[PDB]
Amino acid sequence: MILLEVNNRIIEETLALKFENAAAGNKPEAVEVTFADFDGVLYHISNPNGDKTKVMVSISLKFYKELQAHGADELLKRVYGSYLVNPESGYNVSLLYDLENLPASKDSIVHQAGMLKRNCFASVFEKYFQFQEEGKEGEAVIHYRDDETMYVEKDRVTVVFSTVFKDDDDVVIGKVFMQEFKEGRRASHTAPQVLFSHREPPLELKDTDAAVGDNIGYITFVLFPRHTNASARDNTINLIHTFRDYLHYHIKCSKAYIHTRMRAKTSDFLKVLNRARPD
Amino acid sequence: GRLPACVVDCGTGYTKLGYAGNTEPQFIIPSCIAIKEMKGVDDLDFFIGDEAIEKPTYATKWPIRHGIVEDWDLMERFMEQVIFKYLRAEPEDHYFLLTEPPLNTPENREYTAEIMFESFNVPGLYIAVQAVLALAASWTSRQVGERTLTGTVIDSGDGVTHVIPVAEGYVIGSCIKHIPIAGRDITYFIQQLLRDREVGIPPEQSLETAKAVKERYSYVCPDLVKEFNKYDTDGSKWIKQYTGINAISKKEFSIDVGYERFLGPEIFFHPEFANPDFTQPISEVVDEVIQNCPIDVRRPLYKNIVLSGGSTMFRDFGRRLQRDLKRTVDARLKLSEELSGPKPIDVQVITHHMQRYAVWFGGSMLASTPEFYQVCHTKKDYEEIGPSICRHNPVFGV
Amino acid sequence: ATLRPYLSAVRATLQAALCLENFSSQVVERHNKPEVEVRSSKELLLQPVTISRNEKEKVLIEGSINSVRVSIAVKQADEIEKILCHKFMRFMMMRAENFFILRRKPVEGYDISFLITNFHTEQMYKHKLVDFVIHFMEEIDKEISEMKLSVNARARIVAEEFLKN
Amino acid sequence: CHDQQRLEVIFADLARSWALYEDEGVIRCYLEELLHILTDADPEVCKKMCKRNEFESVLALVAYYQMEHRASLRLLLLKCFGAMCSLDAAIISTLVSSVLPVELARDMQTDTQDHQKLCYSALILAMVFSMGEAVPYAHYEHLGTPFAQFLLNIVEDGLPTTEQLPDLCVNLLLALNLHLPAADQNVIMAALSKHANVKIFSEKLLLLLNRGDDPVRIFKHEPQPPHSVLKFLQDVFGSPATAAIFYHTDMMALIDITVRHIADLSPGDKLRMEYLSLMHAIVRTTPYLQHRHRLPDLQAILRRILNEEETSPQCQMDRMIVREMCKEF
Amino acid sequence: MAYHSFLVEPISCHAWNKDRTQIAICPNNHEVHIYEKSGNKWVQVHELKEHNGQVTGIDWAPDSNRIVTCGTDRNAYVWTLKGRTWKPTLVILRINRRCVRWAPNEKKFAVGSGSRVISICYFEQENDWWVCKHIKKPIRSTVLSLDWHPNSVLLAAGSCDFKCRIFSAYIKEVEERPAPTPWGSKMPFGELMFESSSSCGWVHGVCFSANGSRVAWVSHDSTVCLADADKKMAVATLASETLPLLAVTFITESSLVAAGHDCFPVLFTYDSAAGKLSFGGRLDVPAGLDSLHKNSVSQISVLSGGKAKCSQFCTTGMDGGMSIWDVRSLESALKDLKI
C-alpha cells in the first residue's frame, strides 16, 4: 500500500467478526482489546457492565478538547447518531452497539466506524471549507502530536503543519521529499500548491508562539476551491489528515530500501573479497 | 508511559502481532509476503498477511524458515506493513518487543536490532527468548503457588518442533534437542492419508482440506488398536463427515474423515510412521533432554513441562506425553530400587490456556509490567553504545 | 585534478606496503598483534605516507612489519552524499567481523579505515588485495552515485504520486 | 559437416509457402533445430550458411517470419535472428537492410497481448539496429514519430508483467537514435518536442548515464559504433524544446553527473571529449547560467584540462573541443 | 623449475637431511611435519607435536642426523631419532622472548630471537643437558636470519636494527681454538667482529660465503649489501627496482641468488675488480602471477654443490609450493645469464 490506510483494520476486522458471529444467531461472545493509531491515538473496545449483549468502543486523543471546541459533537451526532452514547470513563469518544438490535447492511457501518479518527479530525476541515464557501474571511491550532502542531487558516485555503523530524537523516530525506513536492506542479497542473519551510514557519504563523529549530519543519499545503468542495471532501480530508504519517512512512521506506541496496552492495564487495582468496 | 507498546512474534507458519496487555492478538496473520517476479517505490508494493497467500499477479514468498530468518529484506518489508498497514501505530512514539528462536544467533539478534533501530527509530527495543516467555505463560495456568522460570519447554510449530530446557530464565543450549515432526509435517501426513483413502477432491484445494482435517476433527488417541477397532466395529459414531467447497467449480465437494484424525496426531508419539530417518519418540526426546541437563535442576525441568506453539494444542497430547514419561520414569525407578543394596520422581506436563500462542502471551505479560520499561534497551543506549546494547536481554518477573 | 594515475600511485603504494610478515610481540610474553595499530615499537613502524588527489578526497597509508593500516576519506560533494557515505561506511563497519581486512572504526580525520593484518596478508593474495582496494574506491564512487540517483528518483515518484491524489 | 547439412535442409524445407501450411509441431522441431545449430555449433559454418547465396536463407527466414501467423514460431525466429546477429556484422547489415525491422515494428504495435514475444521483438530490433550503418527511407514509414511517441509512452506510462520490457524499450530507443540525424531531422527529437511531459525517461537515462555501461553494445565487432547515451543526450540537449524534458532539479543533477564524469575522466580517453561536448550542449541549449550552479568546479576542471599539454592526439582533440566551447563571461 | 603443491597456507622453515633423502617443514602450526620422497609423489613419514606454538626456526644436523627446532613456544627442541620415533629433548633457551641454525661443527647451535640476544647453545655431556649462553653485546633487535661461516666459530646475523653484524659465539669448552681469519684476529665469545653501516631497512637476509671471505645480507629497503673482508671489510650495496628480498644465499664465490617480496628468484654477480655489485636478472621467467610462487619467498637453502658451485637450489616461500631449482637448467634457459 503506497498511500496510508485511513480505516483501522483492527476495529474493522473485530466488528466484522462480531457481526458475522451474531448474524448466525450464535452465542454472544465477550470482546476486550486495546489498540492504537497514528499520531498517538488510543483505542479500547470492551463489553460494558459484563453484558455480552452490549459492545462499547472507546477512543482517546490528547487534543480531544481542541477538537470538541470546533464542534465535534455535532459531526459525531451527524455521523453516528443512535450509535453515539455517553463517553467511557477516561475516554474521549465512545460508541455503543447492541447485539439485539442491528441493521442488515453491515459494510456501511464498519467502513464508517473504521474511519473514527478521520471523522474526528474532519470537523475543523469541514468548518474551514464551509467558511471558505461562504466567503466570510478574517476568521486554528491543533496539537495532534506531542512535539508537533498543525495550523489551519479569500480565494484559497492554507493548511500549514509544523511537525518534527527527530532523526538527523530523516530531516534530510524529508527535505528531499519536500523539495520534490514543491515543484510537484509539473506532474499534475490541477493539483494543490505545495510550500516548505525548513527552520522557521511561514509569514502567517509568525510570533504566534512558533516553535523554531533545525529539527522542526513547517510544510504549507495550499488547497483551492477545486479540492475544498463538498464533492471531493472525504478524499482530500483522508489524504490531508494522513499527510504527516504518509511522509514519515515514506521516509522510513526510503531508509529500508537504502538498507537493501547497502546489503546488496555489501554482498558484491564481499564477493570480490571472497574472490580474492586462494580457495 | 501513556500509550502501549507493540508485540510481534514471527513464527515459521504464522506471524502473531498485536498490542501488549490485550487478551488476544490484534492481528494473527500468515508468515508470507507478496513480491514481484528495481528502483523507485518498487519495495512499497509489498503485501503481507493473508492477503498474500493467493496472489496471482505477484509471487507468494516465505521468509521465516524453521524459526530462523532466511531473507532479511523481505522480513523488513513484512515488519513494515505490520507496523503501518496492520497496526498503524507511531513507531517513534512506541516501544517494541520482538521474539527470537531457540537457536537464534547473536549476529542475527544484532541484525534484528539494526533493522528495528536504524530504519524504524523505535523508542524501545527488546529481543526476548520464546521459551522464557513461554514458561511465564505457563505460569498463567498455575496461579501464584508455583510461578517460576525453571522448567522444560517444548515448542512445536509449522516449521520445527524443539525441546528446550529453561532454568531461571536462562536456557541450557547444551541440553536443547531438536525434533523433526512439525505442524507442516502432520498436515502433510494428513494430506497423504487423505490422498490415499478417498477421491473426488480437487488438487488445488487438497492441502487446505488436509489442514482443515488437522484443525477440526484431528484428535490424539490412547491406543492404536482401539481407535481402529472402534471404527471397524461401530464406525457410525466415530467416522465423521467433512464438507467443503471446491474453489474451482463453486460446488459442494464432500469427503469422509476417519482413521487419519487419529493417525496425524499420533505422528508425534511415533515418528517412525512417516520418517525413516527418525526413530526417537517424543517421550525419549524429553527424557534425554531432562537427563542431559544439570542434575540439580532436573527435577524442576521434569516438574514444569510447558507446551508452547500451535502444534501442541491437539487434544490429549500432554496426557499421553506425561503418561509415557512417568511410565519410563517409574520403570527406571523400579530398576534402580531392585538392585539397591529412592524418592518419588514427580513429573507434570502443564497445559496452558493460551498454549497455542504462549510465546506472544508471555511477551504481553512481560511488557505489561513496569520492569519492562527498565529492562528494555533504550534508543539512547542504542545510538550511544551500539548494536551490542541489544545483544543481552535481562530476565525479570520472578 | 581527478585522474586514474592517483589510484595507480595508490595501487603502487598499496603494493609496496603489502610486504608484511608475521611477528611476535617483543613486550608481551606469547602475544601476537598488529604493529601498526598499537604502535608500541618505533623500530618496526615505517614512515606513514599520505596521498591526496584533492583537498577533500584522499588516502593515508600507514605500514608496519606486521600490519598495514589504510585509511580512505572519500569525496564529499553534497550533504545527502555525505550522510549516505557515513551510513554506508557505518554499515560496512558493523560487518567488520566478516571483513577481516577492515576495522570497526574509521581513522580519525578519515571516512573509513581498513586494517590489513600480516595474518590477513598471509592468507590472501597481495595482488588480489590491491585489486580489492582499487575496486573498493571505484565501486565506492559508482555505488554512491547510483544510490543518489535512485533516492532522488524515489523522492520524485512519491511527490508526484502524493500530488496526483 | 552435419550441422551445415541440417541448417541447409531446414532452410530449404522452410523456403518450400509449404512450411506455413504444415504442422506447428514439425515447424517447431525444425526451428529449434536451426536455432540450436546456430547456437551450439561453429560460427564460420553458420555465417557461411546464413550468408549463402547473398543471405538467401536469411532473407527466406525473414519472409517466412513475415508470412507466419504463429506466435511461438515468431519467438523462435526472433531468437534465431538474435543468434544470426550475434554471429557477424554482415548478417546484421543484411537483416537490417531487410523489412524484418518494419514487420517487427508492426507486430510490436499490433499484438500487445504477448509480453514475451514483444520482449524478444524489442531485443531483436535493438540488436539489429545496434550498428546503425544503413538507413532506408522506407523503414521510416513504419517506425517513426508515431512509434517514437508509442515507445515514449511505454517508458513514461508503462503497460499493465515482469516490467523487464521498459528497459528493453529504452535500449531499443537508444539504439534507434544512434542512427538518427541532427536535431532538425531527428524523429525522436521531434516526438520529444511533441510531448515533453515525460519525466521517467529522464530518470532512466540518468541512471543509465551514472552507471557508465552501455546497454546497446552487446556484441564485439570491428569498427564499433559511438556511445549511445552521449549521442542521445546531445540530440536531446541540442535544442531548448527537446532539452525541456529535464526538470528543475533533474537538470542540476544531470549537470552534476556530466561534470563528475568529465572531471574523473583521465586525459587520453575518448569519452572525455564527448562528455565535454555534452557539457557544452547542456550550457548551450539548457539554462546553465540561470542558477549558475556547478560552474565553479567546472571552471577549475576546465582550467586544469586546458593546461594539459599532452603529446597525444586525443587530449589535443579534447583541448580543441573545450577551446571551441569556451564561451566565458 | 620443479614446484610441488604441498599446502595452501604459507611455509615457515625449510630443512633437509644429510643425503637429502628426507625433507622437513612446518605449516604455521603447533606441529612440525617430515616428508620423504618415494617416486614422483611425496608422502609424509614423521610428525612432531612437541612445540606449543607456531614453529619459526628449524635446522637439521646432517652428519649428526639430528634436527633442532625453536619457535614461539619460547623453547628449543633438539630432536634425535629414537628407533621408529623422533624423540625430542627440551633445550632450555633461557629467553624472555625466530631463528635457529646448527654450526658446521654440528656441535652447538645458534638461536637468534627477539630477546635481542643471540642465544648460542651447546650440549653438556657432563650434565647430560643442553646449555644456552646468550650473546647480547651490541644487539638492539631480533635476529631475523642467522648463518655461520666455514670456521664454525663466527656467526653472522641480521637484526631489525637495520644492520647485519658478524659476532662470535665460540664456546671454548665444546671445540678447539679458532684460527686467524681475515675478519679479525681477536675472536671472543660476545666480541663484535663486524657490523653494517645501513640506517634504513630491516636485515631479513644474511649468509656468509664458503671461503669465509665475504658475508652478504639482504635488507628490506629494496637493497642488498655484500661485504668483503678481502678488501679491508669493504661494503658494497645495491638497490633493486623490485621489492625487498627476504632470503639471501650465495651460489658461487662471486654469484649469489636471492628472492623475496618480488616473489621471483633473482640472480646477481659481484665483480671483485671494480668492487661493486651487479644484477644478473630474473632466473625465474615464465592465479595471475608471472612466477612460480604466488607469494613471497621465505627461505632458500642449498640442495647439493656447496656455496661455491651449487648444483641445485631449494626454495620455500609463502605460496605453499616447494620450488626445486637447478643451476644447469637455469643456465640452459637464460643464455644472457653469466654466473
Ligand SMILES: Nc1ncnc2c1ncn2[C@@H]1O[C@H](COP(=O)(O)OP(=O)(O)OP(=O)(O)O)[C@@H](O)[C@H]1O
Ligand atoms: N487447531 C489446531 N490444532 C492443532 N494444530 C494446529 C491447529 N491449527 C494449526 N495447527 C498447526 O500448528 C502449526 C503452526 O504452529 P505455531 O503457530 O506454533 O508455529 P509458528 O509459531 O507459526 O512457527 P514456529 O513454531 O517456527 O515459530 C501449523 O503447521 C498447523 O499445522
Ligand SMILES: [Ca+2]
Ligand atoms: Ca513459535
